[PDB]
Tab-separated table of C-alpha atoms and ligand atoms in Angstrom:
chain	number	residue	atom	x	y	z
A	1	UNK	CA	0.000	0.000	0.000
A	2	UNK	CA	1.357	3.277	-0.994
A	3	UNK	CA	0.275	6.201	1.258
A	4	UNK	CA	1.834	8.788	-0.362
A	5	UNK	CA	-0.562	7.417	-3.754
A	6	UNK	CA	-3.322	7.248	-1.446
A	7	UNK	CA	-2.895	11.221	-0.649
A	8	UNK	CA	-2.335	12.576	-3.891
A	9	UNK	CA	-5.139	10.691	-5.276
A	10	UNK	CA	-7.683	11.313	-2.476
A	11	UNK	CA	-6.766	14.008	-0.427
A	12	UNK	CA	-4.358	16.688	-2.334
A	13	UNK	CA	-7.391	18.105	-3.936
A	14	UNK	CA	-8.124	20.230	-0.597
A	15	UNK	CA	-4.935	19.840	1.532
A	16	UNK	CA	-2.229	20.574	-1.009
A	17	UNK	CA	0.975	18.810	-2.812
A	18	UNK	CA	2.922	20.125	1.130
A	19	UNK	CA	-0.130	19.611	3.912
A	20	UNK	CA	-0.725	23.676	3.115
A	21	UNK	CA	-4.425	23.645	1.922
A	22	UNK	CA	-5.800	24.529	-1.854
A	23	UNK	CA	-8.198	27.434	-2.605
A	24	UNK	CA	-10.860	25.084	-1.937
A	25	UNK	CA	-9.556	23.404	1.320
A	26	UNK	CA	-8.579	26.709	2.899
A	27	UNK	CA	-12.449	27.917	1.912
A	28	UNK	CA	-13.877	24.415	3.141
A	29	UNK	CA	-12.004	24.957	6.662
A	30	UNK	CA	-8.949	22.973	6.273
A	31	UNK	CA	-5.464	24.661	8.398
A	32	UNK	CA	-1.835	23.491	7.259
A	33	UNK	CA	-0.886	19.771	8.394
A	34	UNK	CA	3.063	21.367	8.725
A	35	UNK	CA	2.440	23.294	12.262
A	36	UNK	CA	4.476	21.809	14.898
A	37	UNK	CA	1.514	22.858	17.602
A	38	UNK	CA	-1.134	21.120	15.321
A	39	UNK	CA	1.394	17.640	14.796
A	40	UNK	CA	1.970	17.662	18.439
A	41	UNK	CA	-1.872	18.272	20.424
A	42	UNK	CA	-3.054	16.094	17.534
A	43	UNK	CA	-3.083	12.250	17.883
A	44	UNK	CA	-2.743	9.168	15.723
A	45	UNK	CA	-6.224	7.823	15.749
A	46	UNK	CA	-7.623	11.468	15.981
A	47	UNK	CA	-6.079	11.583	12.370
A	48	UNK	CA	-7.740	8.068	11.488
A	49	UNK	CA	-10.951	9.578	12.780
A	50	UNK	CA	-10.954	12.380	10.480
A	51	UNK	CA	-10.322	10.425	7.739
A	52	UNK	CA	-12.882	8.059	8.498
A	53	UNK	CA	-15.535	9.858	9.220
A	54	UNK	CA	-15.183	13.623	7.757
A	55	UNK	CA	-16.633	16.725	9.371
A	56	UNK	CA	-19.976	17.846	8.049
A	57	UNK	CA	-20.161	20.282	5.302
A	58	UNK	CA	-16.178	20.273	5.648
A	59	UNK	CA	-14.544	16.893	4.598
A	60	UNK	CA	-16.199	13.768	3.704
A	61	UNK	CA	-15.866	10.744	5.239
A	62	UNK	CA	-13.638	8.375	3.645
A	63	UNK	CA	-14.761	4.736	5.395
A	64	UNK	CA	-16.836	3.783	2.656
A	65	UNK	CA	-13.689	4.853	-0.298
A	66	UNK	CA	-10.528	3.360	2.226
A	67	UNK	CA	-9.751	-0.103	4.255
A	68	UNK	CA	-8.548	0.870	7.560
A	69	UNK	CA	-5.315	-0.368	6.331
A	70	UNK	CA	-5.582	2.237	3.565
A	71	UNK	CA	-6.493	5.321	5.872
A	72	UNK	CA	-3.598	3.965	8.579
A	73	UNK	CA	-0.692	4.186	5.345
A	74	UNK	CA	-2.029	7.860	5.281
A	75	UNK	CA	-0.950	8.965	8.748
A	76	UNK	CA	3.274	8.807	8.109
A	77	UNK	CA	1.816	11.580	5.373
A	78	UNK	CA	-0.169	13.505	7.149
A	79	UNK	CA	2.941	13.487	10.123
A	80	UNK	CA	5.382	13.925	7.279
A	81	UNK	CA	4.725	17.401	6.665
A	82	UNK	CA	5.633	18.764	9.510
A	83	UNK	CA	8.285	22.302	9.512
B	101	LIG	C1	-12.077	18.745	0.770
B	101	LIG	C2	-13.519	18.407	0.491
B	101	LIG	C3	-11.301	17.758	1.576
B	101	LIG	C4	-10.823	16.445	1.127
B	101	LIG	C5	-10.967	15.754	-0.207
B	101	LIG	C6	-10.129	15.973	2.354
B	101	LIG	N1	-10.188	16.790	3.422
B	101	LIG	FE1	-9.294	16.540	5.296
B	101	LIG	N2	-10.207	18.290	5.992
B	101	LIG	C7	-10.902	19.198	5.275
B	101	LIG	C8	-11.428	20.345	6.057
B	101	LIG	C9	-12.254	21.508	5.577
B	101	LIG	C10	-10.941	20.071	7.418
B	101	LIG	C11	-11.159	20.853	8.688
B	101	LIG	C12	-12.330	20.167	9.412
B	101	LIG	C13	-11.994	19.657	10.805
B	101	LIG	O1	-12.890	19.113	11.497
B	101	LIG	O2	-10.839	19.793	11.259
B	101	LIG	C14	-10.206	18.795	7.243
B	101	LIG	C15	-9.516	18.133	8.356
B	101	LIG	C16	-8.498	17.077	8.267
B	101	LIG	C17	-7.644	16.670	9.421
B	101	LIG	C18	-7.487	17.262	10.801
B	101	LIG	C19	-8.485	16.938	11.884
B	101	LIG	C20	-8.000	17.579	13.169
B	101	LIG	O3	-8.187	16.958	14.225
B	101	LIG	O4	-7.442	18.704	13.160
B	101	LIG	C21	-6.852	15.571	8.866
B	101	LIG	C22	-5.781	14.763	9.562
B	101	LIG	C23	-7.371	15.464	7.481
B	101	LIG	N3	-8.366	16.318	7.162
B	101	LIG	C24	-6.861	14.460	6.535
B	101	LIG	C25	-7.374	14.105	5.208
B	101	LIG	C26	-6.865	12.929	4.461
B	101	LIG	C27	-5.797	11.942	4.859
B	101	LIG	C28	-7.666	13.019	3.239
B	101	LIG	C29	-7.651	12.110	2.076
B	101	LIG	C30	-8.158	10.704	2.292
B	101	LIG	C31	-8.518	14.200	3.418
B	101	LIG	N4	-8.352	14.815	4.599
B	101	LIG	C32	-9.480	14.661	2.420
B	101	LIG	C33	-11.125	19.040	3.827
B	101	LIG	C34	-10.851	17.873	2.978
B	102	LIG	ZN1	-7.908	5.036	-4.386
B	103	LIG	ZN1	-11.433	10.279	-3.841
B	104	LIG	ZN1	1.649	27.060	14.686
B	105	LIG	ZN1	2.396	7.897	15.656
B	106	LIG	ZN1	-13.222	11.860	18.537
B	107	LIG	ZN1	-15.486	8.139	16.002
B	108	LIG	ZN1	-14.061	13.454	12.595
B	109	LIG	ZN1	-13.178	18.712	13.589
B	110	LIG	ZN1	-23.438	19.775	2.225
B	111	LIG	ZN1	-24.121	17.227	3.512
């Protein structure tokens, strides 16, 4: 499983090639995933959360699109970022 594939494919769209959201992300209510403060009060299966189940009107849930093997090879990604 490539999580990096996963991202670009899936989640890129609104959170950007870097973690620093698009036009439409930044609109929709998405911050910048490279924020030491954010990477450190946020957890591991708070990240598996959000991709799971969205936030309404924000991000839609991706349960129904990913395995939870899929949405765990996006959280080195999402951590990746970082400074
Ligand atoms: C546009 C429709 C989006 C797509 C496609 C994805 N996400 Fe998203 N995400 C979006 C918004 C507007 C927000 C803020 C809403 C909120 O409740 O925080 C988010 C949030 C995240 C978070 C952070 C949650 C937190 O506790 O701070 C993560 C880790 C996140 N999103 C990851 C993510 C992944 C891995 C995606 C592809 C499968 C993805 N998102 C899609 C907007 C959108
Ligand atoms: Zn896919
Ligand atoms: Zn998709
Ligand atoms: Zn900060
Ligand atoms: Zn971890
Ligand atoms: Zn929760
Ligand atoms: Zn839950
Ligand atoms: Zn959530
Ligand atoms: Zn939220
Ligand atoms: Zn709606
Ligand atoms: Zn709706």
């Amino acid at each position: 499983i490539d999580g990096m594939k996963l991202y670009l494919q899936h989640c890129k769209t609104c959170h950007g090639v870097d973690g620093n959201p698009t036009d439409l992300g930044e609109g929709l209510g998405a911050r910048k995933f490279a924020d030491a403060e954010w990477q450190a009060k946020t957890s591991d299966e708070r990240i598996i959360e959000q991709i799971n189940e969205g936030t309404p009107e924000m991000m839609m849930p991706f349960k129904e699109k990913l395995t939870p093997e899929e949405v765990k090879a996006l959280v080195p990604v999402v951590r990746g970022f970082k400074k």
